[PDB]
């Protein structure tokens, strides 16, 4: 599952979280089995 977010929002990409990204966009289940991988693509701008 793949997307771009602001760096401060990356902490919301975890099971059972709450906040705008975790509530209105991409919610991981409380028993999620998986890996979350992220990097600042800041040179893209």
């Amino acid at each position: 599952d793949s997307f771009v977010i602001r760096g401060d929002e990356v902490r919301q990409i975890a099971p059972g979280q709450t906040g705008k990204i975790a509530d209105y966009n991409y919610k991981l289940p409380d028993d999620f089995t998986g890996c979350v991988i992220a990097w600042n693509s800041n040179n893209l701008d």
Partner: protein
Amino acid sequence: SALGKLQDVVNQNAQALNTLVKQLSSNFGAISSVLNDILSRLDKVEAEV
């Protein structure tokens, strides 16, 4: 004082049940012993712990 044996059995039953109910008020290291506090003061991940 004659019926001490039967009154002791009634007292032990009441003492056991009151002890079992009073233990609902204990924290056991939790943030509160009121379960609705835990479910309202915390996010679901911390609340489950």
